[PDB]
């Protein structure tokens, strides 16, 4: 019945508020310029972003390092670092997914290690506009333009992110919806390497009603929706994809070898 | 709080069967013979050692590196790539730990570097008794009294760590237990040259907690089982101290041994 997917709606909600702080509404608040009180530091070149600096260090020192490397590649050993953080925002929201901690364990880890990257994605284009990128928890703001400013391959890399946000923010989801959505994503019986797909598939169905229900009741004016959004997985995907081969090459033709040592670890047959 | 502690000490000993393949339980049905798979090879002397690395035949070669001297010295190689081992998987399982990845990556670093031989050390326990110790996934077994006889200085690398166990393993925690305690070695505020040293403080006393509630639950009528287990950090401490002596004793009585490179950077500079 209606109700229990009505119930499960809402237990992911709450669940998806705990475990990611920093939500749409929040992020389309500060992106707006709304309740005008203390506005985020804009990164537009290389000047501010070293300005920047001295704005989230001159109080103290608190993230992935600071100024002694070329700035291209400390962005971007700056991404992998929130990369790494969003894993485990994402690993501590899994546990909220009804069935999913009493799945065996070996398949918790590969619906995460496959489905990670897609979530980063999507949840990205809640800190996106078509300007620019929200960073440091809503501190800061990063514009795309000074990302696709920096050298090749790191200008390249940056871009398809924000042309996948605002293909994908123009269906107009909120927290509720997205809390669903990515629930269906992470239980995808798919992945390879699964051991037992039968109970993740009915899993994956149960969400699939609510998010269905969720839209059709949040978005009554939004012909097939449901499709809509079910459709835009085929382009993540293929996203992902682009991502993860780019990735090889820099990891290949670079100089700084410093990862974190989350991406290393994953990406066992990630094509 | 009480619900959150409970759900603390779940996430990590999830992420704890997930990141350590020989766990405890396992360790301890091998040793015991409460096993529905294979008796482990016994390594007593130097014909027996021989026969352990023959028993390649229908069980392929073990993973770790290759060897061309003495005895004494093959032993220590073997202990150098197993762990290098322990250390990827140890950092694998710290990622997880709630507020870690959120923290300085220099603090990262640092944790990792003053903490993962205390942490390989203490779960090293969980597979030995007092007659020794298994080895190469539960495939073998290397007795004390043979370890301890290695000339000079390798003898006095081994003993120790038995002496240890004995000990820690009359305590009785399980791997739940150990979870927990693994944990609160990693986020320790007292290592050299933290740069924000409260943080760490901060997840150190949630996981202290988490402990605290853990060993009443499971262990009742063990009295101030917290007090002892904690005061099990100086034992492990001074084992680490022990051992950079000893690995200096033997930069100056072998050739070229020289460390993995992990190991090297790990025992830079260390205390
Ligand atoms: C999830 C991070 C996204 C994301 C995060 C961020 C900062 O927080 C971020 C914050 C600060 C600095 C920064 C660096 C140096 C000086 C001052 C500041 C740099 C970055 C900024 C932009 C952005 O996004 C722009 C494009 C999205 O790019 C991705 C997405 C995932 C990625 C990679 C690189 C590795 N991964 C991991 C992986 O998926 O395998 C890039
Ligand atoms: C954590 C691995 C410890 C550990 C691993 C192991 C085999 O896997 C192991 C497996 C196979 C062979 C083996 C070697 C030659 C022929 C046939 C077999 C030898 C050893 C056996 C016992 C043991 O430990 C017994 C006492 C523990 O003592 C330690 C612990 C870490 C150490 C040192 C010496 C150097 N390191 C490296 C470092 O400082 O990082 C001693």
New binding site residues.
Partial sequence: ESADLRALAKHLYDSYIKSFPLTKAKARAILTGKTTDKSPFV?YDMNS??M??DK?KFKHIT??Q??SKE?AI???????????E?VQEITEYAKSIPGFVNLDLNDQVTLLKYG??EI??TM?ASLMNKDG?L??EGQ?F?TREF?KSLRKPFGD??????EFAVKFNALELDDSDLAIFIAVIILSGDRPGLLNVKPIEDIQDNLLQALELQLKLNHPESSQLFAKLLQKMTDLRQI?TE??QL?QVIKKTETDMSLHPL?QE??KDLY
């Fill in positions: 990164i972003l070293m920047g600096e989230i993230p992935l600071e100024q700035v400390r962005i971007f050993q700056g991404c992998q670092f929130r990369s790494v969003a990670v990257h980063i994605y990205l990128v960073i440091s800061g990063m990302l890399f940056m871009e398809p992110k924000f992902v991502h993860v990735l991406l994953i990406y």
